[PDB]
Amino acid sequence: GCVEVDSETEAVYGMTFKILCISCKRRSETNAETFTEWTFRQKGTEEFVKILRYENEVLQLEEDERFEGRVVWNGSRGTKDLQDLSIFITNVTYNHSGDYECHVYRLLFFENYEHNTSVVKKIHIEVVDKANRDMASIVSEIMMYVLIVVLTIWLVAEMIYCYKKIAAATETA
């Protein structure tokens, strides 16, 4: 089943990065004919330029040079009922930092009814020079060592105490 996950927000310079855009239908059993368009406002500017449009299983790329090459479809294949609209950058550069817009245009087909829907997803992408470990993993590892050591110490302390008491009471008689 479809699950809306959010994309990561930090790409390593020079490497490859996949931008996630997932939009599930409310009821999975229906039919649709989805198509998508992406726009991108580069950090330092205020306007969104269209970069790509993916309709009818053919991706037509805009005439932009920032994304000339360097980007390939990585969404749903050969369906026309497109639920994952993700794109993938190859050779990320600094110019690819800013806001992204994932316009999803869906046309649900019903009994006698045709509903033209639309959704928007905003993603913020920051290009760093080398990967940064997420604070969550760090503090978790740290606390997971702290707990181990404190348990061991508590146990050993209580053990030495009890053992002294036992050695005492042994030869008391």
Binding site: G1, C2, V3, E4, V5, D6, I22, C24, K25, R26, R27, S28, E29, T30, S76, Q83, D84, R106, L108, F110, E111, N112, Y113, H115, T117, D134, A136, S137, S140, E141, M143, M144, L147, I148, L151, L155, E158, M159, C162, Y163, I166, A167, T170
Partner: protein, 1413 residues
């Protein structure tokens, strides 16, 4: 008077008259062995040949005065008549009456009536009969009228004590006659309703067939005892119906309505102008292929309308509108359906989808406390009534048999003999028994997709086995004389079977009974040396048609009656109003238009499925007529079924069978041969050994002591339990939405790392504390060891090396077992587990028998429906092609060539081999998935032929027979032995309860007493004049009874709330409720003024006081709720408070208070079971949500019910705990190959591939689950309820009279003036002679005074309390209260006299007298 034979003559009549005249001028029971209808006692010898069938004088002296005369049959039965001329016309000497009464008392007369009754029963089963049927029914009514005339003329009708109309059965007969004649002459419009009555001629079987009338009396008594339970059931259903109608009023009218509307149309106009499924599909959202619109909800945990639709409350309820909570009546119907668990899972799913998932709680409570508690209550009451009845009959039979005993106070013959030896040989029989097993195991290798050579192999093998068995049959017949041969039952059994085999080998073209050879292994029960389980089952089936043959017959009779009634009432309607229940305007699968289908419907109702067929009936024939007929079948039929089941259960599994056990003198060939061959094998073992041998530091002890302290302490244990709970929760957090929960993902990883470390530390500590011996000769420690081992393994591999690539990604799924570490930790679960383990050995012993029985049935099924379940369907529609377009499989393949999306597919669960035959039988036995298999069966044609509609119609017989022998008998045996095992465990441990801990027993003893305590304290009267009167008021019985009315009035006030009622009725019903609130508060205030402080002493007066407060705040709060805040969901749940005013109704009932008390006694045990069930469900949920989270969603698996989260999975699991719809969940798991599942489907947001299921895992999952659930919930709830119920209905014995102890003391002072509490033994002989009755002991006292074993203190002196105890124990006997009364009597004495030094006993009066003699 063995020669008391005197023709009732005119002289005798005159004598009787003068006797009566002399008695009436001056102004006991008859011997029950003399009464008419009995059999003539042998005490009188034979009849004089001139007296039989002739007016004789009455024998019983009780009638010797009254005007009677009895006549005796040539079968020695009694017929007591009246002497008055019938209708003042025919004296007992009128030749007419003479010859009539002669005819009446005759065996042939009865056999004739039985014959004609059965013939009429057969003729009633014709939907449309010809006219010569009119002639023969004229004959029938003629016969009935004639025999009724002989009765009325012989016996008498106007005058007497033994007359025609003086017996209800003749009432029935006369009713039949008059109905027949009146309808035959004058007729009305609804002639069918008239003719429906003539089925009572079938009821006349009860009257004519012997023994039945006693059975009907027994049933009516059983019902009479079912009085309080019905009231309790109605009351509970009513309470839950009020609750539901409060919560779910109008929810099932939710629908997804399209948003954009053209032509300036509104919802109102639309709903006013569209009345066809097509139009509703145009405007509302219908799931493809469904009949009702999809239900939606407003919350976040309810259904979801697709984009472009919105949820609105409009239209009609689902299921033609018969499923709702809109009015009280419909809510009551729905709850009754929930109680009997009839397709309740659909109601469950609908309600959860329209209201939200958090209302699962409602259904949890209802099912257990309603469905499970009431069935068992009904079970318990029926069982106790029956057990009492039977034991009464049997003790009376002992009394009668006691009374009876007191009344007694050439060369061919040469080789015949040589053959006898060979054919009896203790080895040939064993060989034949192994040959039988080989033959069945040979036949069991028969599967559908079978090469031809396999077929010839099987054919020649079957021929070989037929040869073997026929040869042995011939040998027996030639050694043993034919008569002696046909004497034994097994001989004729094997004879018939081998003869049928030969006959079909006779090319006679039967091809239907060759399967029946498979019935031959039942001979293995012979050599089973009364296998502790097998002979049990055979004697079950024997008792069914043998001892209890008069019950099965009644069941068959009533089923026939109901089938015919249903047909007569509803057949023509089913035919006419047909397009209302079927679009193609043809008859549905379950109709009532001919006898066979109506019978099948009735049978289906007894199995427990009555709601769908009932909905179809209510449309065609109206609601009221249909409801009444179904409810009578459901109530009466299930009553009789319960009776039959429990009868056998108790009769064949209780002290009865183990009592009067006789030894079998047959040296079984089994034991002989096994001893001989055991000696042979030990001999050859010994000679093989022979041939082989002839040819050829205190510190460490301190360490262990210390580790022992820490592991034993209590902080340590509690800490470990905390860690266990945390680890199990961590498991519960990992669903399919774990990707978006990032931080939690990483946290749970490191948390798993630390848990593993902790548990390894614990294990090491235990090792150093206990040691390897003590630790590894334990059972739980092995469990913890295994768990930590798999955890450590995966941890290691996950990090250093292979790092989760191989089957490690499958070993990782065994984390779901980590909660198993809780069983050992909690005592409440350890006791239940222990009991179940103790019961295990008897379970896997009836299991073998069950598998053998089902193996037979599955082989037969495989031979009947091997590869005949294939069909050529239109995948888009899902419909079978007409078998005139696509006749066979090649044609379907040609259509696949040309057209698209057609498929020659096959049922997932079929009979293609014995493996799936077992699965198929499991669905039939549980009635969950059975209908599809049954439809597939009655349509089969041949191996590669398109199925046709009801081509092989009578294959329904196959499933009917199985359900009876499998689904009904196997359940009997299982519940039978299991329940006995529990009774054997209790006795082992002292008769204590085997489901309670040691801390719960204390609680149990207290609440047992604190419940049932008769004596109370009267409340003093207040002093004041203005308070006196109020007190006189509130105490009267008048006052209490009146309040019981205002409670029922309040109940009916809640019952008239319906969906969409006028604003007026809302305001009125509001103001009425206010008045009721005023009145009960007033009652409370009056009680608190009459009883100044003693009001809070009574347990009930407190419960009223709470209800008063709660009801009031329910009024104010709800008012405040809606006005300055808004929350309808809360609004409703707070109005549930007013229900507490109805609960007070159980304060006056006495049966109900007793039945509920049995429940309160049972919570401690049911709570333990509830725990163990929950842990099992949790473990299954983790397995499910990690195996089945990506299945197709094809059926039973929906957007809301699936294994994607912990919420959803637990919801599904709770559903199938009652096995409801487990076939639906399994179905989408059994498809593992395209074009069913796509093994490379990508899911957005995850990395898992493919939505296929694993059939092997899939099957094991559900089959194991529904088994475990049956063993726990069904069989322990029955055990727990059964024990408490008995002790609940038990009273207490405390008959002591205070004046008797006073006289005991007042006489004691005459012998002990110094009040030393001691008396001399020489004076003991006169002390007992001065007491008044019942304490009086008549002289000689010395003979009884010694046998009481009175202890004696120093000085040949005796204490007072020992005399009181020895005197009290004789008048009361050896009762259970006697030692408890002795316990309190000594304790109060020890607290009053601390000088123990003077009470030491030296000897007893028996031992002292033994010293003297």
């Amino acid at each position: 008077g063995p020669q008391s034979f005197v023709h009732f003559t005119k002289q005798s009549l005159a004598l009787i008259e003068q006797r009566i005249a002399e008695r009436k001028s001056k102004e006991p029971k008859p011997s029950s062995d003399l009464e008419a209808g009995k059999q003539l006692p042998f005490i009188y010898g034979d009849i004089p040949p001139g007296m039989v069938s002739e007016p004789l004088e009455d024998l019983d002296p009780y009638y010797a005065d009254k005007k009677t005369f009895i006549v005796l049959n040539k079968g020695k039965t009694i017929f007591r008549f009246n002497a008055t001329p019938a209708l003042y016309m025919l004296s007992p000497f009128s030749p007419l009456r003479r010859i009539s009464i002669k005819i009446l008392v005759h065996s042939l007369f009865s056999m004739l009536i039985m014959c004609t009754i059965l013939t009429n029963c057969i003729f009633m089963t014709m939907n449309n009969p010809p006219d010569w049927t009119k002639n023969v029914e004229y004959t029938f009514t003629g016969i009935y009228t004639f025999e009724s005339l002989v009765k009325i003329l012989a016996r008498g009708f106007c005058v007497g004590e033994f007359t025609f109309l003086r017996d209800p059965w003749n009432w029935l007969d006369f009713v039949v006659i008059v109905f027949a004649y009146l309808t035959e002459f004058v007729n009305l419009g609804n002639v069918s309703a008239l003719r429906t009555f003539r089925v009572l001629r079938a009821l006349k079987t009860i009257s004519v067939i012997p023994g039945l009338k006693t059975i009907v009396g027994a049933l009516i008594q059983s019902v009479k005892k079912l009085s309080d339970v019905m009231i309790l059931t109605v009351f509970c259903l009513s309470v839950f119906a009020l609750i539901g109608l409060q919560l779910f009023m109008g929810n099932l009218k939710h629908k997804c309505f399209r948003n954009s509307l053209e032509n300036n149309e509104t919802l109102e106009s639309i709903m006013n102008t569209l009345e066809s499924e097509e139009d509703f599909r145009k405007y509302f959202y219908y799931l493809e292929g469904s009949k009702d619109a999809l239900l939606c909800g407003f919350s976040t945990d309810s259904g979801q309308c697709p984009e472009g639709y919105t949820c609105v409350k409009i239209g009609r309820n689902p299921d033609y509108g018969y499923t709702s909570f809109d009015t009280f009546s419909w809510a009551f119907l729905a709850l009754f359906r929930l109680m009997t668990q009839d397709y309740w899972e659909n109601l469950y799913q609908q309600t959860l989808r329209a209201a939200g998932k958090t209302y699962m709680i409602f259904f949890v409570v209802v099912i257990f406390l309603g469905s499970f508690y009431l069935i068992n209550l009904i079970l318990a009451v029926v069982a106790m009534a029956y057990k009492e009845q039977n034991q009464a009959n049997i003790e009376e039979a002992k009394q009668k048999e006691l009374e009876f005993q007191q009344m007694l106070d050439p060369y061919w013959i040469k080789f015949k003999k040589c053959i006898y030896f060979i054919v009896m040989d203790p080895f040939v029989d064993l060989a034949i028994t192994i040959c039988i097993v080989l033959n069945t195991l040979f036949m069991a290798m028969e599967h559908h997709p079978m090469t031809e050579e396999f077929k010839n192999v099987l054919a020649i093998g079957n021929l070989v086995f037929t040869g073997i068995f026929a040869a042995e049959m011939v040998l027996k017949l030639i050694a043993m004389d034919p008569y002696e041969y046909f004497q034994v039952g097994w001989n004729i059994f094997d004879s018939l079977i081998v003869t049928l085999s030969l006959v079909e080998l006779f090319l006679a073209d039967v091809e239907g009974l060759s399967v029946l050879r498979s019935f031959r292994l039942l001979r293995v029960f012979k050599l089973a040396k009364s296998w502790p389980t097998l002979n049990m089952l055979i004697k079950i089936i024997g008792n069914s048609v043998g001892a209890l043959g008069n019950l099965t017959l009644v069941l068959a009779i009533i089923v026939f009656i109901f089938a015919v009634v249903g047909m007569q009432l509803f057949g023509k309607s089913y035919k006419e109003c047909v397009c209302k229940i079927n679009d193609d305007c043809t008859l549905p699968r379950w109709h009532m238009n001919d006898f066979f289908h109506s019978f099948l419907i009735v049978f289906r109702v007894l199995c427990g499925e009555w709601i769908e067929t009932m909905w179809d009936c209510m449309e065609v024939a109206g609601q009221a007529m249909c409801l009444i007929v179904y409810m009578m079948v459901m109530v009466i039929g299930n009553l009789v079924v319960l009776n039959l089941f429990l009868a056998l259960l108790l009769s064949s599994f209780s002290s009865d069978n183990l009592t009067a056990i006789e030894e079998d003198p047959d040296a079984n060939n089994l034991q002989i041969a096994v001893t001989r061959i055991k000696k042979g094998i030990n001999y050859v073992k010994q000679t093989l050994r022979e041939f082989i041998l002839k040819a050829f530091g205190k510190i460490w002890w301190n360490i262990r002591k210390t580790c022992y302290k820490i592991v034993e302490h209590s902080w340590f244990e509690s800490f470990i339990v905390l860690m266990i709970l945390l680890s199990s929760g961590a498991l519960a957090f990992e669903d399919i939405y774990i990707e978006r929960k990032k931080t939690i993902k990483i946290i749970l990883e490191y948390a798993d790392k630390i848990f593993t470390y902790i548990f390894i530390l614990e294990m090491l500590l235990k090792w150093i504390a206990y040691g390897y011996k003590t630790y590894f000769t334990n059972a739980w420690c092995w469990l913890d060891f295994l768990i930590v081992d798999v955890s450590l393994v995966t941890l290691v591999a996950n990090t250093l090396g292979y790092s989760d690539l191989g089957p490690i990604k499958s070993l990782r799924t065994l984390r779901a077992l980590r909660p198993l570490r809780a069983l050992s930790r909690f005592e409440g679960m350890r006791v239940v587990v222990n009991a179940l383990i103790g019961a295990i050995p008897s379970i896997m012993n009836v299991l073998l028998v069950c598998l053998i029985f089902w193996l037979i049935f599955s082989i037969m099924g495989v031979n009947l429906f091997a590869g005949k379940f294939y069909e050529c369907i239109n995948t888009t529609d899902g419909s079978r092609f007409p078998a005139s377009q696509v006749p066979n499989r090649s044609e379907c393949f040609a259509l696949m060539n040309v057209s698209q999306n057609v498929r020659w597919k096959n049922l997932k669960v079929n009979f293609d081999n014995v493996g799936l035959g077992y699965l198929s039988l499991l669905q039939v036995a549980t009635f969950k998935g059975w209908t599809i298999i049954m439809y597939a069966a009655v349509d089969s044609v041949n191996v590669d032929k398109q199925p046709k509609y009801e081509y092989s119609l009578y294959m329904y017989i196959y499933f009917v027979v199985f359900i009876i022998f499998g689904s009904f008998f196997t359940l009997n045996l299982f519940i039978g032995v299991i329940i006995d095992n529990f009774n054997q465990q209790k006795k082992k441990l002292g008769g204590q309860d085997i489901f309670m801990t040691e801390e719960q027993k204390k609680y149990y003893n207290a609440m047992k007493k604190l419940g049932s305590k008769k004596p109370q304290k009267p409340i003093p009267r207040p002093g004041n004049k203005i308070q006196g009167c109020i007190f006189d008021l509130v105490t009267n019985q008048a006052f209490d009874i009146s309040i019981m009315v205002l409670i029922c009035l309040n109940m009916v006030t809640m019952m008239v709330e319906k969906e969409g009622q006028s604003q007026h009725m809302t305001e009125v019903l509001y103001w009425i409720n206010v008045v009721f609130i005023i009145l009960f508060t007033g009652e409370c205030v009056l009680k608190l003024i009459s009883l100044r402080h003693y009001y809070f002493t009574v347990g009930w007066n407190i419960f009223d006081f709470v209800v008063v407060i709660i009801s009031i705040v329910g009024m104010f709060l709800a008012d405040l709720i809606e006005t300055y805040f808004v929350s309808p969901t809360l609004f409703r749940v707070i109005r549930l408070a007013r229900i507490g005013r109805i609960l007070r109704l159980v304060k006056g009932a006495k049966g109900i208070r007793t039945l509920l008390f049995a429940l309160m006694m049972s919570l401690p045990a049911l709570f333990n079971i509830g725990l163990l069930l929950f842990l099992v469900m949790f473990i299954y949920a983790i397995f499910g949500m990690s195996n089945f989270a990506y299945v197709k969603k094809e059926d039973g698996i929906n957007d809301m019910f699936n294994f994607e989260t912990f919420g959803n999975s637990m919801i599904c699991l709770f559903q199938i705990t009652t096995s409801a719809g487990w076939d639906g969940l399994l179905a989408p798991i059994l498809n593992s190959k395209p074009p069913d599942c796509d093994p490379k489907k990508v899911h957005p947001g995850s990395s898992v591939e493919g939505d296929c299921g694993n059939p092997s895992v899939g099957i094991f999952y559900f089959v194991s689950y529904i088994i475990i659930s049956f063993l726990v919930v069904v069989n322990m709830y029955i055990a727990v309820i059964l024990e408490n119920f008995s002790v609940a209905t038990e009273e207490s014995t405390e008959p002591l009279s205070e004046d008797d102890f006073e006289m005991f003391y007042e006489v004691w002072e005459k012998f002990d003036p110094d009040a030393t509490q001691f008396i001399e033994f020489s004076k003991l002989s006169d002390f007992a002679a001065a007491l008044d009755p019942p304490l009086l002991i008549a002289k000689p006292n010395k003979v009884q005074l010694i046998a009481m074993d009175l202890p004696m203190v120093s000085g040949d002196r005796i204490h007072c309390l020992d005399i009181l105890f020895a005197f009290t124990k004789r008048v009361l006997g050896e009762s259970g209260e006697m030692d408890s009364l002795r316990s309190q009597m000594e304790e109060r004495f020890m607290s009053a006299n601390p000088s123990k030094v003077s009470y030491e006993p030296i000897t007893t009066t028996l031992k002292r007298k033994q010293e003297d003699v």
